[PDB]
């Protein structure tokens, strides 16, 4: 309700508020992946600032990256999205990989990226 | 191949380590180009015209 | 076959996302210049 459609300050504070409260819960990583799935899958028609919301999600994951479930669930989404190789949703994969890439590098030859 | 092309533009554009894959594109995406192609296929007068229209309507019903 | 054998280097939504996260460009000013000769004058002015 708030982070997708809210104002930047409301968006930022809601995201930061959600991290501080529920960032340490086991289901937190699943929530991030579910949000990622629901909001960025190519079947989503909802119009919203994907880039601004994505920056928030990257920020949110970084501030909750101490929760082992964050990266676990994010890679499970990437695992499931790539299952067709082993139909692929390339835009969804791009969002997930970039989120996963930014989160992992927070966890020199790649400094060019 | 008109039916195959309709399937590619509307239903499934994926290929039928050396085999072509073309996994990179979402199915059914539209542009001015796809719209023009579909319109010319539909409104082109030939023996297959009927069949092509049939395919189109089929995809409509399937979607619904 | 060739379409199979090539990957598109044109920029895509990943490059757009990187841009959202903030003709050629001189990177010398950003670099550090050194020399193997101990007696060389420091060349940062270059």
């Amino acid at each position: 309700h708030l982070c997708i459609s809210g104002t930047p300050k409301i968006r930022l504070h809601t995201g930061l508020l959600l991290v501080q409260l529920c960032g340490g819960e086991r289901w937190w990583g699943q929530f991030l992946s579910n949000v990622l799935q629901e909001l960025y899958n190519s079947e989503q028609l909802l119009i919203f600032p994907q880039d601004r919301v994505f920056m928030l999600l990257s920020c949110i994951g970084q501030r909750s990256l101490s929760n082992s479930g964050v990266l676990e669930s994010l890679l499970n989404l990437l695992d499931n999205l790539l299952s067709p190789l082993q139909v692929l949703d390339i835009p969804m994969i791009s969002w997930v990989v970039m989120l996963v890439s930014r989160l992992l590098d927070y966890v020199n030859q790649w400094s060019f990226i | 191949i008109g039916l195959k092309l309709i399937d590619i533009l509307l239903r499934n554009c994926a290929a039928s380590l050396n085999s072509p894959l073309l996994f990179g594109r979402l199915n059914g995406l539209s542009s001015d180009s796809t719209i023009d192609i579909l319109y010319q296929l539909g409104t082109t007068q030939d023996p297959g015209t009927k069949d092509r229209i049939q395919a189109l309507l089929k995809w409509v019903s399937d979607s619904a | 076959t060739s379409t199979r054998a090539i990957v598109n280097t044109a920029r895509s939504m990943v490059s757009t996302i990187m841009k959202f996260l903030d003709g050629i460009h001189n990177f010398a000013p950003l670099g550090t210049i050194t020399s193997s000769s101990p007696t060389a004058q420091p060349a940062e002015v270059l």
Binding site: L75, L78, D79, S83, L88 | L17 | -
Partner: peptide, 20 residues
């Protein structure tokens, strides 16, 4: 790290599957 292998294997397949 079995799921890690799975995603990495699928990532390589994706790498190997990348075309135009």
């Amino acid at each position: 790290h079995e799921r890690c292998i799975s995603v990495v294997q699928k990532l390589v397949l994706f790498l190997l599957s990348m075309d135009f």
